[PDB]
Design a protein around this ligand. Sequence first.
Ligand SMILES: Cc1ccc(Oc2nc3cc(-c4ccc5c(ccn5C)c4)c(Cl)cc3[nH]2)cc1C(=O)NO
Ligand SMILES: Nc1ncnc2c1ncn2[C@@H]1O[C@H](COP(=O)(O)O)[C@@H](O)[C@H]1O
Ligand SMILES: Nc1ncnc2c1ncn2[C@@H]1O[C@H](COP(=O)(O)O)[C@@H](O)[C@H]1O
Ligand SMILES: Nc1ncnc2c1ncn2[C@@H]1O[C@H](COP(=O)(O)O)[C@@H](O)[C@H]1O
Lengths: 435, 168, 299
Amino acid sequence: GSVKIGHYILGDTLGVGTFGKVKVGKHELTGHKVAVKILNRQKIRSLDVVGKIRREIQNLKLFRHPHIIKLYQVISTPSDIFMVMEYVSGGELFDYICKNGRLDEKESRRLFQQILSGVDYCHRHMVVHRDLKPENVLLDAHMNAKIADFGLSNMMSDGEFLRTSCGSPNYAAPEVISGRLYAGPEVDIWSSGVILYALLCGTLPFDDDHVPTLFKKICDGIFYTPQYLNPSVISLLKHMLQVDPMKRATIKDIREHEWFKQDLPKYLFPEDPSYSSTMIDDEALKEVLYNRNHQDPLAVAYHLIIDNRRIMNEAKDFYLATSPTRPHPERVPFKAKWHLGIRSQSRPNDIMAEVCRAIKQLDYEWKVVNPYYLRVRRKNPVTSTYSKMSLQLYQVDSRTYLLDFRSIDDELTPRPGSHTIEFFEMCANLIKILA
Amino acid sequence: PAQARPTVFRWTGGGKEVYLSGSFNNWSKLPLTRDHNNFVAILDLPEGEHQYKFFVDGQWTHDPSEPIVTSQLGTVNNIIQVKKTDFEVFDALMVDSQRAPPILPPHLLQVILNKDTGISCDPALLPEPNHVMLNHLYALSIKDGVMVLSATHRYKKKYVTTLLYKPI
Amino acid sequence: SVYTSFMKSHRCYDLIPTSSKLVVFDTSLQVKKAFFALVTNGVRAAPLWDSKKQSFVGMLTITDFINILHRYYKSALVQIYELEEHKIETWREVYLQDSFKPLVCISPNASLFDAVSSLIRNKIHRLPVIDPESGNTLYILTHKRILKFLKLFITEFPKPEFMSKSLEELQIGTYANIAMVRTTTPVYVALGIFVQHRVSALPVVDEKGRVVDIYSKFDVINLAAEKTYNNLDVSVTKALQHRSHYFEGVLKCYLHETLETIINRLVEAEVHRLVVVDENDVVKGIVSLSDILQALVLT
Ligand SMILES: Cc1ccc(Oc2nc3cc(-c4ccc5c(ccn5C)c4)c(Cl)cc3[nH]2)cc1C(=O)NO
Ligand SMILES: Nc1ncnc2c1ncn2[C@@H]1O[C@H](COP(=O)(O)O)[C@@H](O)[C@H]1O
Ligand SMILES: Nc1ncnc2c1ncn2[C@@H]1O[C@H](COP(=O)(O)O)[C@@H](O)[C@H]1O
Ligand SMILES: Nc1ncnc2c1ncn2[C@@H]1O[C@H](COP(=O)(O)O)[C@@H](O)[C@H]1O
């Protein structure tokens, strides 16, 4: 007898994983090849990712996109979980660059457009890969990029930041190696910049055998630009590799960049850069894979009305506000400066003590997760329900610190009052004391 | 259908020959395929109890790390119960589960109400918010005995920045 | 109809913009501070929140600012005491001693036919969209928002014959019981006309009855912006001088013009009403968005 799961005959080991090995497989009838990621259930219990594994399976299985590895099926056994995925024969992009050296400009751009399309698709679905690098970018027989190994990925939540140490130092953003909080799309963009550099130069932009030197090189953002590099893509690299995450290029910026726009196929970015819906986008949906796959009429109709809405340019100002001729009639006759939470120049220990005694003064219940992190709950004296908020002390500068208020969604059914206003009133009581 | 349920029999150790004998195969010798120090066969088994034993380099033995049953005749076999909950992925994962202040992220320093918008559009409209900015409390310095609080929240694909005017 | 069934199909959520701003007032807030807040945030109306009841009680609009001014204004030599010393709740108590008005709102999953009906039935220009689950007010729905949504997202064809029918043949708008002011008419008198007739705007006419300007309820909020509200003795012309630098002539229409032409003009201009005029600009009546939406829903 052989080793056979889901009619596939398990072959040689492609690669190893922290939880389990990845093994090629071959259909006993058609000879179709897949990649089977074996997850030992007792191992995923030892370090408890069981919820994280459950989530990764959900998201990856819903994903469809040419340049992301597809998850065909997840087969469960008493001792093991089998993830059946598409198989690409070209292997790692890293190995291809090792063997063949640097790719020319047109081939580097062709692959980078495919890779960034996958990265964009992940961000639209609120997923950050966090592991992006040539080792995790595979190739098929036709040299199409395939993004793999979402094991280190994460699902982004509203109002939350990610401090988790991830990936590799060479591909890690300056804020990642510094342990600073980040949103995470800007980190995938940094990694994509290093991939783009590796495609063009055949070497890594930040590398050193001395680890402290390497971490300084990354935080300095200084890398060598070879003479043969197009100044256009150099400007693109400088923007993606910006140390400041607020000055770092977005995917919208890259799509607008002239070097990226050249030769770009339409299937890679069928959608507007915005990750939020527009009136025009919904219009097509109301009229009732195709966007990312080769064109089909049902897919074609979508672009048809999108291009028809664009040519006129008369419908865009309706659904959203542009930031910078005829003034809007209601904007003509009508400055307050907003700020985040409340600031204190006192000691971090003193301001946390003042908060805690004020939480107690208001008869609020609170749990201490971190010295600077608090989770506070207030019972509404009217509706007899509970209002939750999280408190985090941040450091603005040397002498300045900031208390951050953040609302927490409840799990309740339709409920009395306003969840947003109840959050404001709860903060209002505390702010009144602290001010 | 439910009568074929994939079950992994894995022997961890060395050997020239490793066989699997169980109640399912009528105690015959099924050769296990080796991958370094692991010998494996995957069998589709009916629901319910099965007893099995390994033949390793001429020695009949059982897996000490796996459940066993001892017969009144002194026979020691490994025993496995094939159960439906193991073959549903999310049911299997359901039973498996059962210092200085952090530097302020610059993302939160983007204030949607401080952002100025073109004069040619509705004053009620706002730019598209970053998802990390959602649910965070923003405020105005208390003036005239009135405190103003604001936060941006999401309703399905739409966002609403709510301002509350409350007196102190 | 093409429009009637369209409003029956779509949900209020479809009209909610991607990112918008919403101002909410606590009912214990000083009512003068609230009207200043409407100017600061560029908002014409706000939901009222009672912390005691933990519920949205109602809406504060510019009409309430008009009612307060007309009621308590005495002269320019004496401050308006009630405007400064009242709280939103205290004037609401004065405004409706025996009469009782509830909060008219709508669910985001309700249709447009429901929304247009609610605006017409209650004679309101502000319909708050409130999610029944969270209890949060999502958006403030208006006539202007709905008609522009209809114009943008409805194809011209099929086109009903009624769209090519003239304004006169359709009998849309008010050609009787006109509410107007002379160019010299004091602001206080105009506020009184707003209170009695309860109309959105007053056409400003000359000696010959030709409309040279228009004074709407929105224009009244400029009194709070400039803090000139304590002098109401000035004419409506002087009150409208603030918009003089960039103003196009009063938007009008003729009885022989089609319904489609009028709807296109209003959606493009983003205003609530047109002044029906003859060739010398003499005012024959008014066509508002409430007149149009009542015609599109009924038919
Ligand atoms: C490091 C580690 C990771 C995972 C792990 O758990 C599992 N490894 C497995 C290997 C196999 C397997 C698959 C195909 C095979 C073999 C043979 C030929 N072929 C063709 C073994 C199976 Cl079907 C289940 C497994 N579960 C065990 C260990 C471990 O601790 N090694 O001892
Ligand atoms: N949704 C609503 N619920 C209760 N009262 C309202 C609502 N909208 C407007 N009003 C009141 O109706 C009157 C006319 O306001 P307007 O909508 O500006 O014509 C004012 O007294 C408003 O406070
Ligand atoms: N200046 C005005 N004089 C008389 N009626 C008007 C005037 N403006 C609007 N109306 C009418 O008042 C009703 C509500 O319109 P509006 O107040 O513009 O929402 C409609 O029947 C209009 O025709
Ligand atoms: N028919 C019109 N002609 C000229 N201006 C108008 C007209 N309708 C409204 N406006 C102006 O539009 C602004 C807001 O009007 P509304 O929002 O319709 O009350 C005010 O400055 C009005 O004077």
